[PDB]
Paper text:
Each protein forms key interactions to promote cell infection, with the terminal domain of the fiber, the fiber knob protein, interacting with the viruses’ primary cell entry receptor. The adenovirus fiber knob protein is known to have a highly conserved trimeric structure. Our findings demonstrate a conserved binding site for sialic acid, common across the species D adenoviruses, therefore suggesting that, along with CAR, the receptor can be used to initiate cell entry.
We performed X-ray crystallography to generate structures of species D human adenovirus fiber knob proteins HAdV-D15, D24, D29, D30, D32 and D53 in their apo states. Additionally, crystals of HAdV-D32 fiber knob protein soaked with sialic acid could not be obtained. CAR binding was investigated for fiber knob proteins of HAdV-D24, D26 and D32, and was found to be significantly weaker interacting. The respective IC50 values were quantified as 0.02931, 0.001261 and 0.01996 µg/10e5 cells. These values represent fold changes of 162, 6 and 110 times weaker compared with the IC50 value measured for HAdV-C5 fiber knob protein.
Author numbering:
A (entry chain B): 184 to 377
B (entry chain C), C (entry chain A): 183 to 377
Write the structure that this text describes.
Amino acid sequence: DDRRTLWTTPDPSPNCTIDEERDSKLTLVLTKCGSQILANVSLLVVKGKFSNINNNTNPTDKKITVKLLFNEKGVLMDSSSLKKEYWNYRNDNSTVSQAYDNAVPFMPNIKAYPKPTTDTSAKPEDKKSAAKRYIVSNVYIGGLPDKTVVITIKLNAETESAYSMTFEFTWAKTFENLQFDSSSFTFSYIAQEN
Amino acid sequence: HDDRRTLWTTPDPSPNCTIDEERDSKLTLVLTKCGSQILANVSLLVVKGKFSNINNNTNPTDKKITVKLLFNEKGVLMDSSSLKKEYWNYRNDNSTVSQAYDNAVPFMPNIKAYPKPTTDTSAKPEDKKSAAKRYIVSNVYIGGLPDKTVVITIKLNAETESAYSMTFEFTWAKTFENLQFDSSSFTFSYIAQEN
Amino acid sequence: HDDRRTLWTTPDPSPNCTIDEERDSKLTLVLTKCGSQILANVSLLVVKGKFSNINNNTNPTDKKITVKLLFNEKGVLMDSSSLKKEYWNYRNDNSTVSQAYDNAVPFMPNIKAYPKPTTDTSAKPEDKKSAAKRYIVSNVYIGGLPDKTVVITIKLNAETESAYSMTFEFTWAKTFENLQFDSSSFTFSYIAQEN
């Protein structure tokens, strides 16, 4: 039993809805290293549209969005892309018996990543960072170096939640009969506390 | 409340960093000690002066930002650093410990992994020291926009004037037009010194 | 003292890695356990042989380096690994513990996350296992120079002859001209096994 790891499991059952119910397996591991969460994420789409990307037949199919929305206790809300049953603290290679009550120490820090406001100040010195809540990099479908995908992670940008972590996968290339299967990506973010 | 495993700006700093003019930028830098590695997270918002409004039509040579942290043998930030000292400290809640730290050696880049560059080329060519190992190079994105590519170059212990150093170099090849420098967050690690 | 939360080369290794000829490279690899994840940091300097002076005018096919770590069921490095065993160990200061380790299972890539590839023509298409999840693919830069791009491909538990494995593949498309292979440092993580 391990409250320093919040994860899917390492080998989840279909646990993620992109197009149809549970069409994907999100493997997401959050490990608390004090003031930072060390995050690791991979996504396999097992059925439906993104199990077979074809941008000759479907030229608009170039984006996948996975949304994790959390309430003020850091509990996953039902409106999340990820399903709740095996999103929990680590026990061995599974989850603790019952649903967690609190994961605030795993939430994106609300000072670093405040909930977006519509501030009326033009003055570039009054600007709140737009970019700081983003992690943007590349992952590779099948770990093939030519199959470039942009991964965009955004923290606490979702309006209808206390905290949020969204994963956006986009590609410019024309993929042809290609199962969405992302090489693993590691990032970190500043942690909230109790 | 008080946390010697985190050395940070705060997570929401006041202007704390000089690129062009005094305190024209906000560097958000968190160093978290995970034993023999420091887990580093860095973002930079330029609030005033040249890089608060990059324009490479008017200023085609404005394609580089260098932020230097220089540390003495105790790991104290030297006044010549780009980063200002007032809120560079160990974590207390979402702020810093009351008084200035006197020692942060355990957050310094390991001096065996990243020795201070020497003026020796007389070495046995196989005893030649890595030039690259002290570098982290990747991309960040202004506004997190995927077209606004910036190269981030981090260099450890390369500054001659200091016992330890951590330098952030942001460069771009594209012609940016009235664009506030605002980098997506970057995570890296480095091998830690010890006391 | 002694630190079983760090499994490393040393931070400043002697030639410890065979790419072409015996001990022609220095691999600096640090694995630090942060619970259910290993925080990994890797850099590679080739000190002698072909890749100490890459020339793709003279040798246009010399565009790949592979470093293989193979582990048995106890997480002990097997002799068929690219890396040499003498200074692959738990941390003591900037060196290794006196005696070779018996067990490093808690540093191995998680076998549920990264199962050994099977040749299963039993294939309910929805039960198809990830090909990509065991990969980390990114760029490093020789000399930390932004133009000297190298692809780094890390694969976990893909080697057939071992209980666990971690392979580093460096590739480039550009024509390098009298360039010592010297990679900027790369940080990643992976999900840890436990005992």
